Amino acid sequence: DLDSYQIALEEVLTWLLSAEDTFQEQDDISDDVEDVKEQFATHETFMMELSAHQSSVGSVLQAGNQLMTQGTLSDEEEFEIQEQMTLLNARWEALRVESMERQSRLHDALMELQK
Ligand SMILES: [Mg+2]
């Protein structure tokens, strides 16, 4: 219902706020092959973390969609939810893109530094 959607959302946003912060405080790509390997490894682990939380993110977005389409909510409640989902989707997609670009650069670095 609305209550269980709000609780799922809070949990997802708490996780995501820390995932964004963790991603932001990664060191810039090193020139040493052994350091780039550790950074490649750390980022691969983070990419699986992101992966594992995808279904919780989809769940909250699905729950919010159902609640809005079912027509049982107040105009204010539908306002709040639309705003919540909009913001969540924006941040989730932004983190997806950024982390994928990070992975590409680390991948290209590791290969170049090994050849
Ligand atoms: Mg209404």
mmCIF file of C-alpha atoms and ligand atoms in Angstrom:
data_model
loop_
_atom_site.group_PDB
_atom_site.id
_atom_site.type_symbol
_atom_site.label_atom_id
_atom_site.label_comp_id
_atom_site.label_asym_id
_atom_site.label_seq_id
_atom_site.Cartn_x
_atom_site.Cartn_y
_atom_site.Cartn_z
ATOM 1 C CA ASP A 1 0.000 0.000 0.000
ATOM 2 C CA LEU A 2 1.098 3.676 0.429
ATOM 3 C CA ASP A 3 2.789 2.936 3.786
ATOM 4 C CA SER A 4 4.820 0.011 2.507
ATOM 5 C CA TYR A 5 5.859 2.020 -0.604
ATOM 6 C CA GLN A 6 7.102 4.880 1.637
ATOM 7 C CA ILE A 7 9.148 2.409 3.768
ATOM 8 C CA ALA A 8 10.677 0.669 0.674
ATOM 9 C CA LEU A 9 11.527 4.092 -0.781
ATOM 10 C CA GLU A 10 13.291 5.300 2.397
ATOM 11 C CA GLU A 11 15.395 2.110 2.458
ATOM 12 C CA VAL A 12 16.350 2.468 -1.284
ATOM 13 C CA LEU A 13 17.202 6.220 -0.861
ATOM 14 C CA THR A 14 19.306 5.552 2.259
ATOM 15 C CA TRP A 15 21.295 2.914 0.310
ATOM 16 C CA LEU A 16 21.582 5.119 -2.782
ATOM 17 C CA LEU A 17 22.736 8.234 -0.932
ATOM 18 C CA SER A 18 25.733 6.156 0.369
ATOM 19 C CA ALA A 19 26.403 4.508 -3.030
ATOM 20 C CA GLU A 20 26.620 8.006 -4.628
ATOM 21 C CA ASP A 21 28.958 9.221 -1.912
ATOM 22 C CA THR A 22 31.145 6.023 -2.172
ATOM 23 C CA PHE A 23 31.350 6.425 -5.972
ATOM 24 C CA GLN A 24 32.219 10.132 -5.632
ATOM 25 C CA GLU A 25 35.129 9.451 -3.243
ATOM 26 C CA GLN A 26 36.881 6.883 -5.507
ATOM 27 C CA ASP A 27 40.449 7.976 -6.317
ATOM 28 C CA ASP A 28 41.253 9.076 -9.863
ATOM 29 C CA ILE A 29 42.773 6.394 -12.100
ATOM 30 C CA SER A 30 46.412 5.662 -11.243
ATOM 31 C CA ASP A 31 49.385 5.251 -13.660
ATOM 32 C CA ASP A 32 50.695 2.164 -11.807
ATOM 33 C CA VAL A 33 49.342 -1.157 -13.099
ATOM 34 C CA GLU A 34 49.112 -2.654 -9.592
ATOM 35 C CA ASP A 35 47.084 0.333 -8.304
ATOM 36 C CA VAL A 36 44.798 0.289 -11.406
ATOM 37 C CA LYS A 37 44.162 -3.476 -10.714
ATOM 38 C CA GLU A 38 42.986 -2.745 -7.166
ATOM 39 C CA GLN A 39 40.826 0.120 -8.439
ATOM 40 C CA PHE A 40 39.464 -2.060 -11.258
ATOM 41 C CA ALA A 41 38.678 -4.787 -8.660
ATOM 42 C CA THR A 42 36.960 -2.288 -6.242
ATOM 43 C CA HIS A 43 34.884 -0.820 -9.042
ATOM 44 C CA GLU A 44 33.866 -4.314 -10.311
ATOM 45 C CA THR A 45 32.610 -5.074 -6.777
ATOM 46 C CA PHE A 46 30.723 -1.779 -6.714
ATOM 47 C CA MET A 47 29.173 -2.630 -10.072
ATOM 48 C CA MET A 48 27.780 -5.900 -8.568
ATOM 49 C CA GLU A 49 26.518 -3.911 -5.534
ATOM 50 C CA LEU A 50 24.584 -1.618 -7.949
ATOM 51 C CA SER A 51 23.349 -4.737 -9.804
ATOM 52 C CA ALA A 52 22.098 -6.414 -6.604
ATOM 53 C CA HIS A 53 20.067 -3.286 -5.668
ATOM 54 C CA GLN A 54 18.416 -2.889 -9.071
ATOM 55 C CA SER A 55 15.451 -5.016 -8.140
ATOM 56 C CA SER A 56 14.758 -3.011 -4.963
ATOM 57 C CA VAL A 57 14.837 0.165 -7.123
ATOM 58 C CA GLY A 58 12.462 -1.358 -9.749
ATOM 59 C CA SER A 59 10.136 -2.532 -6.916
ATOM 60 C CA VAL A 60 9.693 0.954 -5.436
ATOM 61 C CA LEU A 61 9.145 2.456 -8.946
ATOM 62 C CA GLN A 62 6.608 -0.327 -9.728
ATOM 63 C CA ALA A 63 4.827 0.227 -6.380
ATOM 64 C CA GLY A 64 4.622 3.979 -6.998
ATOM 65 C CA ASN A 65 3.284 3.450 -10.499
ATOM 66 C CA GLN A 66 0.612 1.088 -9.332
ATOM 67 C CA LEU A 67 -0.488 3.464 -6.574
ATOM 68 C CA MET A 68 -0.763 6.386 -9.015
ATOM 69 C CA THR A 69 -2.634 4.328 -11.699
ATOM 70 C CA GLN A 70 -5.042 2.722 -9.147
ATOM 71 C CA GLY A 71 -6.637 6.129 -8.478
ATOM 72 C CA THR A 72 -7.086 5.728 -4.683
ATOM 73 C CA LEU A 73 -4.693 8.514 -3.658
ATOM 74 C CA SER A 74 -5.209 12.236 -3.003
ATOM 75 C CA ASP A 75 -3.917 14.791 -5.516
ATOM 76 C CA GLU A 76 -1.261 15.770 -2.937
ATOM 77 C CA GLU A 77 -0.121 12.165 -2.438
ATOM 78 C CA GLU A 78 0.122 11.671 -6.214
ATOM 79 C CA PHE A 79 2.093 14.917 -6.460
ATOM 80 C CA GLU A 80 4.574 13.678 -3.813
ATOM 81 C CA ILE A 81 4.998 10.231 -5.355
ATOM 82 C CA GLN A 82 5.507 11.543 -8.922
ATOM 83 C CA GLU A 83 8.218 13.862 -7.562
ATOM 84 C CA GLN A 84 9.819 10.955 -5.613
ATOM 85 C CA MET A 85 9.927 8.642 -8.610
ATOM 86 C CA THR A 86 11.171 11.339 -10.942
ATOM 87 C CA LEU A 87 14.081 12.117 -8.630
ATOM 88 C CA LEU A 88 14.866 8.447 -7.896
ATOM 89 C CA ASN A 89 14.927 7.565 -11.578
ATOM 90 C CA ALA A 90 17.118 10.603 -12.372
ATOM 91 C CA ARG A 91 19.676 9.662 -9.709
ATOM 92 C CA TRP A 92 19.614 5.955 -10.566
ATOM 93 C CA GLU A 93 20.186 6.581 -14.274
ATOM 94 C CA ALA A 94 22.882 9.223 -13.482
ATOM 95 C CA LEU A 95 24.735 6.718 -11.272
ATOM 96 C CA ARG A 96 24.374 3.992 -13.957
ATOM 97 C CA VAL A 97 25.962 6.191 -16.652
ATOM 98 C CA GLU A 98 28.745 7.488 -14.416
ATOM 99 C CA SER A 99 29.652 4.061 -13.073
ATOM 100 C CA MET A 100 29.639 2.567 -16.551
ATOM 101 C CA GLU A 101 31.994 5.278 -17.810
ATOM 102 C CA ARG A 102 34.245 4.661 -14.798
ATOM 103 C CA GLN A 103 34.296 0.941 -15.629
ATOM 104 C CA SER A 104 35.262 1.692 -19.306
ATOM 105 C CA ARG A 105 38.187 3.893 -18.301
ATOM 106 C CA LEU A 106 39.477 1.431 -15.758
ATOM 107 C CA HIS A 107 39.060 -1.410 -18.285
ATOM 108 C CA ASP A 108 40.991 0.543 -20.983
ATOM 109 C CA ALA A 109 43.658 1.567 -18.441
ATOM 110 C CA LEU A 110 44.188 -2.004 -17.136
ATOM 111 C CA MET A 111 44.535 -3.360 -20.712
ATOM 112 C CA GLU A 112 46.887 -0.538 -21.839
ATOM 113 C CA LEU A 113 49.073 -0.815 -18.678
ATOM 114 C CA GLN A 114 49.351 -4.607 -19.214
ATOM 115 C CA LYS A 115 50.213 -4.539 -22.992
HETATM 116 MG MG MG B 1 -6.577 11.611 -6.727
#
